[PDB]
Amino acid sequence: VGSLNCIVAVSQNMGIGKNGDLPWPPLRNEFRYFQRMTTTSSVEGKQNLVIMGKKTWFSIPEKNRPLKGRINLVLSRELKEPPQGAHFLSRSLDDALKLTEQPELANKVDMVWIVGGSSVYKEAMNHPGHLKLFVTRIMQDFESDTFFPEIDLEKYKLLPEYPGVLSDVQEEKGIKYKFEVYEKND
Numbered sequence: 001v002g003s004l005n006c007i008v009a010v011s012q013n014m015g016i017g018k019n020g021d022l023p024w025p026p027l028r029n030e031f032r033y034f035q036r037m038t039t040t041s042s043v044e045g046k047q048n049l050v051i052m053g054k055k056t057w058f059s060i061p062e063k064n065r066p067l068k069g070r071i072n073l074v075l076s077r078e079l080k081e082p083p084q085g086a087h088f089l090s091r092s093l094d095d096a097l098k099l100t101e102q103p104e105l106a107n108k109v110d111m112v113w114i115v116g117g118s119s120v121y122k123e124a125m126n127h128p129g130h131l132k133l134f135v136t137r138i139m140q141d142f143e144s145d146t147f148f149p150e151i152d153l154e155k156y157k158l159l160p161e162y163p164g165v166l167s168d169v170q171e172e173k174g175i176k177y178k179f180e181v182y183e184k185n186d
Ligand SMILES: NC(=O)C1=CN([C@@H]2O[C@H](COP(=O)(O)OP(=O)(O)OC[C@H]3O[C@@H](n4cnc5c(N)ncnc54)[C@H](OP(=O)(O)O)[C@@H]3O)[C@@H](O)[C@H]2O)C=CC1
Pocket: 007, 008, 009, 010, 015, 016, 017, 018, 019, 020, 021, 022, 052, 053, 054, 055, 056, 057, 059, 075, 076, 077, 078, 079, 090, 091, 092, 093, 115, 116, 117, 118, 119, 120, 123, 146
């Protein structure tokens, strides 16, 4: 099993969600970036795994789930089996990370990508170890009911460049945004 990473898009006011959807109008190319980064494995014969909370799973349009070309794992303590279309269900983040190391998935899983929401991000971000955050900075305020946790810059270093990640300002639907990659190792 390869690297552990979080990926998020976030507004200036740290918003990630509103009413079970994104706070901003759909950004097609941002979604294409998310798909590209999470799907692409750097190892032959292997697949990346995505971990998400229950509400995140149901926020994804049915036509886009499961997230194609990746193993889809949902976190829930209420569910008794994986949701329709999903591949796996775990009851904690630790339990999910162990499952990747079982004979089942040990040699099929390359990268692990936590794709939301807040509580999964928080726990991952504050757990000791090697972790990268792929953060899309939406450069406006958007009314939100769900927020990204604090990035501690004492631990997380913003990388000055990263292969496959554009460094200039993007714009869709009159909304500017930029891609960032952070790395910690503790
Ligand atoms: N902008 C972005 O990049 C992203 C935005 N979003 C948006 O964020 C919102 C969804 O996020 P959020 O509200 O934080 O909800 P989550 O997706 O984190 O779902 C919360 C539920 O998942 C389960 N859960 C979460 N963590 C764990 C855990 N560690 N172990 C076991 N179960 C867990 C619980 O289900 P149970 O109660 O069944 O135990 C919990 O009620 C939506 O508005 C969505 O559109 C989501 C992802 C990314």
